[PDB]
């Protein structure tokens with residue numbers, strides 16, 4: 021049995037390196053949002069809340085984790101707090117991630133009423149509520165759901181602990197049924213699955229709207245060919261009526277409105293000629309629609325397409341951060357499931373526990389890099405902060 025301080029040294033050194041990185045990177049995130057007005061929106065307010073949680077991981081949770089690794093003597097409820105505080109930060113992260121997903125869904129599903137529904141004031145209140153709920157959920161063991169009533173007295177005595185004191189170890193004070201059923205299944209897995217559902221609805225909404233834009237564009241060009249090859253005024257009329265409906269459907273801001281004002285008007289002119297039985301005159305009038313199409317309508321099509329592709333890209337960036345949270349925290353939770361559900365299985369080795377802990381902590385480092393590589397406004401703001 022090699023000296024415990026050696027393996028501890030590696031684990032502690034790595035934890036400290038992660039702490040420094042988690043603090044520096046996320047302070048940079050908060051600083052960027054503070055300085056740049058272009059980054060000051062509801063979505064990034066939840067980003068800041070998420071960054072704040074990761075800063076507290078470096079400042080508090082990792083020092084707590086280092087202290088716990090020693091198994092030092094402590095009052096059981098004191099040990100409980102140290103042990104549970106990371107649950108608060110993880111829970112807060114989950115709420116922030118869920119809020120970001122919902123915010124992006126609202127932005128893509130109902131953009132016309134997004135600004136009136138999703139404000140900074142309401143977002144601030146939501147963030148406040150979610151932090152309170154995170155403390156409630158994370159510190160639930162301090163409300164009585166703990167193992168302090170049945171301390172490991174043999175372990176405490178061997179370490180020379182005083183009366184009322186226990187060897188401070190996570191699994192000795194935090195019940196595994198809490199960790200598996202309440203924390204993991206209810207408070208982590210269900211919100212993550214809800215998140216997945218939201219992002220599925222986001223991407224499906226994007227795909228449908230991009231399809232609708234193309235269908236309108238196709239309806240516009242197809243009916244133009246119909247009018248040109250028509251032989252009677254009735255055929256011209258039917259094609260124009262479908263165009264007028266498609267034009268108004270695509271219409272649903274000054275150069276934009278004027279472009280469609282021309283289009284609908286030109287359709288009405290051709291429609292009037294069509295209802296008079298003047299086929300040739302109707303077709304010639306309908307030919308003018310191509311000029312409006314190339315000068316105005318096509319420009320609106322590409323810009324609308326460009327805006328949706330940007331929303332898709334932004335939603336993907338947010339989903340990546342959500343996925344990374346899951347990837348980093350799932351090993352710890354899975355290990356707890358094995359410990360809990362399979363008492364006939366040997367406990368996961370200490371080195372693997374340390375690795376799972378380090379991995380969870382690394383998640384507090386990765387987000388600033390995702391923002392830098394995927395979000396131009398962040399990356400450019402980061403450069404300005406660092407250079408100056």
Ligand SMILES: CC(C)CCC[C@@H](C)[C@H]1CC[C@H]2[C@@H]3CC=C4C[C@@H](O)CC[C@]4(C)[C@H]3CC[C@]12C
Pocket residue numbers: 093094095097098099101102
């Ligand atoms: C505002 C921020 C910076 C304050 C941080 C306060 C932290 C460091 C304090 C608050 C409560 C404290 C714990 C309260 C009770 C005990 C029981 C004792 O037997 C060992 C120490 C221990 C486990 C303390 C460790 C440090 C602790 C977690």
Ligand SMILES: CC(C)CCC[C@@H](C)[C@H]1CC[C@H]2[C@@H]3CC=C4C[C@@H](O)CC[C@]4(C)[C@H]3CC[C@]12C
Pocket residue numbers: 346347350351352354355358365366367368369372
């Ligand atoms: C989320 C992604 C990365 C998947 C994570 C899978 C990891 C967490 C899984 C895969 C295989 C698993 C191990 C398979 C077998 C055992 C032996 C048992 O006596 C204790 C648990 C232990 C040691 C498991 C711990 C968790 C484990 C390491």
Ligand SMILES: CC(C)CCC[C@@H](C)[C@H]1CC[C@H]2[C@@H]3CC=C4C[C@@H](O)CC[C@]4(C)[C@H]3CC[C@]12C
Pocket residue numbers: 353354357358359361362
């Ligand atoms: C987010 C997605 C991946 C769902 C999470 C899957 C989790 C809940 C699954 C994946 C693998 C599962 C484990 C696989 C094998 C065993 C060994 C058995 O003796 C007891 C149950 C136990 C320990 C399972 C518990 C639940 C488990 C950890």
Ligand SMILES: CCCCCCCC/C=C/CCCCCCCC(=O)OCC(O)CO
Pocket residue numbers: 097144147148151152155156159160162163
């Ligand atoms: C916009 C900024 C957001 C900032 C807003 C953040 C507010 C966080 C404070 C929570 C205190 C309430 C937590 C309640 C959970 C109770 C469990 C508990 O405290 O028990 C410990 C104990 O004394 C057993 O001895």
Ligand SMILES: CCCCCCCC/C=C\CCCCCCCC(=O)OCC(O)CO
Pocket residue numbers: 079080083084087092093094
């Ligand atoms: C600028 C940011 C603000 C600063 C944020 C604060 C940083 C907290 C640091 C360490 C927490 C570790 C505390 C635990 C130390 C306990 C060891 C101990 O108590 O040992 C006595 C004992 O009874 C065993 O015998």
Ligand SMILES: Cc1cc(-c2nnc(N)nc2-c2ccc(F)cc2)cc(Cl)n1
Pocket residue numbers: 084085088102103106107110190191349352353356377380381
């Ligand atoms: C101080 C500490 C303890 C644990 C820990 N140590 N042992 C066991 N069995 N589970 C957990 C743990 C697992 C999932 C979770 F969300 C929080 C803590 C994990 C982290 Cl990141 N920090």
Ligand SMILES: CCCCCCCC/C=C\CCCCCCCC(=O)O
Pocket residue numbers: 079083084086087090092
């Ligand atoms: C920016 C402020 C951050 C605060 C710095 C914290 C750094 C210290 C890290 C870990 C302290 C661990 C204390 C070890 C517990 C005592 C071991 C024992 O009693 O056997």
Ligand SMILES: CCCCCCCC/C=C\CCCCCCCC(=O)O
Pocket residue numbers: 149153156157160
């Ligand atoms: C750990 C379980 C937590 C228990 C939750 C029950 C208490 C919180 C319930 C609802 C929080 C809703 C916050 C609403 C604030 C009012 C906003 C307003 O006045 O406009």
Ligand code: NA
Pocket residue numbers: 070073074109110113383384
């Ligand atoms: Na986090």
